[PDB]
Structure 1
Amino acid sequence: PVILLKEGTDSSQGIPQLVSNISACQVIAEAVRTTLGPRGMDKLIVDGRGKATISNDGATILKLLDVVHPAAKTLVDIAKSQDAEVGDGTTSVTLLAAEFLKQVKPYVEEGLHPQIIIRAFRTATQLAVNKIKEIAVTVKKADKVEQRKLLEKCAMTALSSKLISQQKAFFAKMVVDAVMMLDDLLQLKMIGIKKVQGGALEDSQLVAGVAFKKTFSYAGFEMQPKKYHNPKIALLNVELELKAEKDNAEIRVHTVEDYQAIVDAEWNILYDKLEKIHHSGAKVVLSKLPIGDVATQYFADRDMFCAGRVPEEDLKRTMMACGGSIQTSVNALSADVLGRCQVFEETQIGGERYNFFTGCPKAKTCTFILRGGAEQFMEETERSLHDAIMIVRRAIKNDSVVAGGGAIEMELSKYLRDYSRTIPGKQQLLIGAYAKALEIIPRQLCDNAGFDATNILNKLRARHAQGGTWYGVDINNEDIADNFEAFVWEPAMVRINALTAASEAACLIVSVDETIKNPR
């Protein structure tokens, strides 16, 4: 007899497969459970090459987990989606999905239809989205100072549970000034993040221009002054070295006369190109192609600066900061294709030579200098800076903040309970469990902070039922206070997106009752 499928196929039923999926989801969520509030701790992941990865964000932890389970990949997908969308609540959506799954596990084991559960999840998500959009309460016409203060408060709230929580009052203004100088398209590729070893965390500065690392140098780099008052930057893209004209060329020289003529003509062409480059009135020469030793020595005899091997992103940032253009040919070097700045220095920071370009008022970009650790600390600082920049960019386009902590979750749970207390039938238990699952955020916060969770949750529920709406948890006073009055704001695009992602993950996980695995 011949078997149906290939030898090595595994299959299961529906109830055990769903139980295994719930167990896998709970095990996955238990790993990124302690990382939430400011009192949470980060993890340390080591791969096979021996490199450590210390990051407080749950996205990197889920990416470095390397999970081959066919059902546990739903959390990583929604986490990546949330990180690419707003880039903030990466673990909140996973915690909410795990809580919903743990709440529906007894209902599934008791014998309930999954379609009814999916419909209840969709209805609860729609009701929560409607409630959030209704209690949004955004400003209609505010001044620039109010918007700046709101952005600073949002940045301080986003940088409160990271590693730079002690210096949240310094990076807020920096990220505000960085986002405000990004025109309207909001280009993230025009923000350079440099990591130089040495210094302290408070020694970080933000320049209003461009700054890159010093590339290769020849024997004519120390015979030139690295300081100019009002120079001119000329953006080029041609190679300045003694080489052949074309690779597919052949010269059939006759006697010594034509040989000497060609030898003289090569140097004549080189000198003509050098004179055409110098006659543009510039002082700083930048090009992507490496510069030879002849041009480096020629530019040093006229008090001119030159630098080769310039990256494409650095050149684009310098062009956007100054206002020039990429000129490949040297036959059209006017005055509108050159840069302009007010000051140009070349200091040594951390034992490495760096070039500074600032002073131009028409700058549309900036450069960040992150100091502190060596590798892991710098990566964590860069991740926190990117998260704060994304939060500010989202708050600029949304201009509608809400109370943080756990007041919105308590309000949504109370609304869901009040809605379920009216409709009878089996629709009440599902909405009740959905509302009770939303109360795990303050409990998790109290567990991470090491405080009493039961009494705090009971007091919050009593205050929400006796109402006195934006009331969350407090870690300093170890009690409850007003989150809206404590300058604790968060964008509204993080809660709705996380709720939708959790609902989609639940609908995709519950609607699965079979798992077929093929050999090899």
Structure 2
Amino acid sequence: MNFGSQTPTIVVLKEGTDASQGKGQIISNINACVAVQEALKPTLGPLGSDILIVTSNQKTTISNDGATILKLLDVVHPAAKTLVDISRAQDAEVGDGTTSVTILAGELMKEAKPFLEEGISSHLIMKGYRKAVSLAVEKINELAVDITSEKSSGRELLERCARTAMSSKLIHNNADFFVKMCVDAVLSLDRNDLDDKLIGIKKIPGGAMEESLFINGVAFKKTFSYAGFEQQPKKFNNPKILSLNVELELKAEKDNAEVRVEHVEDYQAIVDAEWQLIFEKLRQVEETGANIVLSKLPIGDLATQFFADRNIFCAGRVSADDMNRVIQAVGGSIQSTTSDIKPEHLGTCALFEEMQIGSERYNLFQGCPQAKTCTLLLRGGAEQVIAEVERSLHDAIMIVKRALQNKLIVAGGGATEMEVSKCLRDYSKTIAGKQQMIINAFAKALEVIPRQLCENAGFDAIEILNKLRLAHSKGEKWYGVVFETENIGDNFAKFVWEPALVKINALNSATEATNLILSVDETITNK
């Protein structure tokens, strides 16, 4: 009846598919997040340390924020990918607190360890944190004071909040000069339409970072330059900027036109018609007096010798993102027809000068007060100093990006976490149930942000935190820790502020990161 000697049993899952039951896997998932958490533990704070990562392709990448550190390390574990997703989400939405949101997410998982060791299943502890966030977000809104009541100046607001962003970086001593760059850069943008692509920074080598300069114009980097370059004047007084999407090339990318002729006299006409058409396009541009011609697609060789004669500047092979930044500065839009041009579409600038830095040449527009864009030429010693300072000012721009939309001041230095925690402790004592110990653990998890500020500074943490617990018994606000005077005090007197969106999205993202892998008990991996 049977087909053969024996019949081995079937494994239900595929051969090699890992699976496990019980409380061991969720503890392993929590320990996996804590293992990723320990890498970013000493990074938190102004006195924190950077992290050096080298991937398989052997490209050095130094960073301080946890957004790109987790992007470099390709994470296999799904539970450890939760910290990476919120870090990119925090980087995409706000742009600040990418390290603290991962530390708070792991600390809630760390404080959930002994409750999971108890018989309480994960559906109780999820309800406690989810109930606590509903009061924490409201308490941050109640502690948010408005700036217009004092009738202060608007220029000093951006400088005050951007000073906090330049901590824990290479800039904190040179922040007196570079904070004016990003504040004046973002103010040139339109308040209604604030764009993230108009703040592109070129990774130009050479030079010290303090030698940079902020200009309302935009640069592009010299392009291919067929013979013709270094004959035109590289300095103009009031040049007219022109942009053309049409490809000025003698049938380079055009489709192959099958020309068929049957006469010798017409062969002289058809070969001169190529010269006749291309010169008609040059003469039409010549009549308008366009002193600076630009194009995304390449410029022909004959045009360079023609524009070199009448001191007309030309450049091609510009990218779409860089060319879009030019149009926001120089006014009129792009036209791809030489006959449909108009004087009114041309731009203008009060000064123009080409100067070399780092053995590279960059054309710089100058004197453009009507420009709704900006540029930054960060120069730096190595290549990672440029990239680190690049993403640092991108985070500084991200603070003033969101500060203009909504103007809310909140405490800093770990103070906002403690006023929220002690309020939840006052709310927890009236519960008298299982949710009391959970909310007290949520209050203990918010205390961790003051810890790493003190651990990286070298001072003992248990003594100073007990001093704050004695200080927060009475009514007090903007009470945290500082490092200059080596003694705690009023942060408002010390003049340090932050936005409220950083703390709100951090608590929601950290609790959502916690509830994702506390609402599971198994991780199956095929293959």
Q: Give the TM bin, normalised by the shorter chain.
A: over 0.9
Deviations 1:23-70 (A, max 9, x none): 111111011111111110001101112111100111111122222112
Aligned to 2:286: 278
| Cα distance between partner residues in 2 of 1:462 and 1:381 | 40
What is the aligned partner in structure 2 of residue 347 from structure 1? 355
Bigger drift between 210-219 and 231-240 goes to: 231-240
Aligned match for 2:489, one of 465, 481, 501: 481
After TM superposition, give the deviation of residue 310 of structure 1 in Å: 2.1
Structure-2 separation of matches of 1:177 and 1:142: 23
- Can you list the C-alpha shifts for 1:301-351, whole angstroms capped at 9, x where unaligned? 222211121222222211110112211011112111211111111122222
Residue 467 of structure 1 aligns to a residue whose secondary structure is coil
**1:94 alignment counterpart:** 102
Distance (Å, rounded) in 1 between the aligned partners of 2:514 and 2:397: 30
Q: How does 1:115-264 map to 2 (within 5 A)?
A: 115-140=123-148, 143=151, 146-183=153-190, 184-243=192-251, 247-264=255-272
Residue 473 of structure 1 deviates from its aligned partner by 0.7
Q: After the TM superposition, which segments of 4 or more aligned residues of structure 1 sit over 6 Å from their partners?
A: none
Question: SS state of the match for residue 525, structure 2?
Answer: coil
Hey, what does 2:384 align to over in structure 1? 376
Residue in structure 2 matched with residue 433 of structure 1 by the alignment: 441
- Contact residue 248 and residue 298 of structure 2 kept, 8 A: yes
> Does 1:289 find its partner at 2:294?
no
The SS at the match of 2:92 is helix
The one-letter code sitting in structure 1 at the alignment partner of 2:35 is: V
Select which of 376, 401, 405 maps to 2:409: 401
Q: Which whole-Å CA distance do the structure 2 matches of 1:359 and 1:25 have between them?
A: 52
Task: Compute the RMSD of aligned alpha carbons.
Answer: 1.6
Query: Which of 317, 336, 341 is equivalent to 1:333?
Result: 341
Cα 1:511/1:357, change in 2 over 3 Å: same
The match for 2:499 is: 491
8 A Cα contact 1:196 1:370, kept in partner? yes
Distance 1:12 1:205, change over 3 A: same
What amino acid does structure 1 have at the position aligned with 2:245?
A: N
Structure 2 residue aligned with 1:104: 112
Cα offsets for 1:239-267 (capped at 9, x unmatched): 33433795342222223211112223222
Quick one: structure 1 residues 246 and 5, their matched pair in 2 at CA, closer, same or farther if it must change by over 3 Å?
Answer: closer
Identify if the C-alpha distance between structure 1 residues 141 and 468 changes in structure 2 by more than 3 Å, giving closer, same or farther: closer
**C-alpha deviation, 1:5, in angstroms:** 2.3
Q: CA deviation at 1:236?
A: 1.4
SS in 2 for 1:146: coil
Establish whether residue 318 from structure 1 lines up as the match of residue 333 from structure 2: no
Could you say what secondary structure the match of 1:458 adopts? helix
Partner of 2:421: 413
Provide the secondary structure at the position in 2 that maps to 1:249.
coil
Letter in 2 for 1:166: N
Cα distance in structure 1, aligned partners of 2:67 and 2:181 = 25
Give the counterpart of 1:300 among 305, 308, 311. 308
CA distance in structure 2 between the partners assigned to 1:253 and 1:245 by the alignment: 23
Are the aligned partners of 1:406 and 1:472 in contact in 2 as well (CA < 8 Å)? yes
Provide the C-alpha distance between the structure 2 equivalents of 1:503 and 1:245, rounded to a whole number of angstroms: 55
Task: Provide the rounded CA distance (Å) in 2 between the counterparts of 1:40 and 1:398.
Answer: 30
Counterpart amino acid of residue 168 in structure 1: A
**Residue in 1 that maps onto 2:6:** none
Residue aligned with 2:174, SS:
helix
Q: How does 1:383-394 map to 2 (within 5 A)?
A: 383-394=391-402
SS at match of 2:260: strand
- In 2: Cα distance, 1:245 partner to 1:504 partner: 52
| Distance in 2, Cα, partners of 1:250 & 1:132 | 72
**Equivalent AA in structure 2 for residue 160 of structure 1:** S
How many residue pairs get aligned? The number is: 518
| SS of 2:410 mapped into structure 1 | strand
* CA distance in 2 between partners of 1:69 and 1:6 (Å): 19
SS in 1 for 2:202: strand
SS of residue paired to 1:45: strand
Tell me the secondary structure at the aligned position of residue 354 of structure 1: strand
Tell me if 1:465 matches 2:473: yes
Report the AA paired with residue 167 of structure 1.
N
TM-score, length basis structure 2: 0.95
Distance 1:396 1:182 in 2: 11
- Distance verdict in 2 for CA 1:246–1:400, change over 3 Å: closer
Take 1:109 and 1:475, find their aligned partners in 2: how far apart are those partners?
Answer: 39
Distance change (3 Å), C-alpha of 1:508 and 1:241: closer
Q: C-alpha displacement at 1:268, in angstroms? A: 2.1
Taking a change above 3 Å as real, the CA distance of residues 245 and 94 of structure 1, as seen in their structure-2 partners, is closer
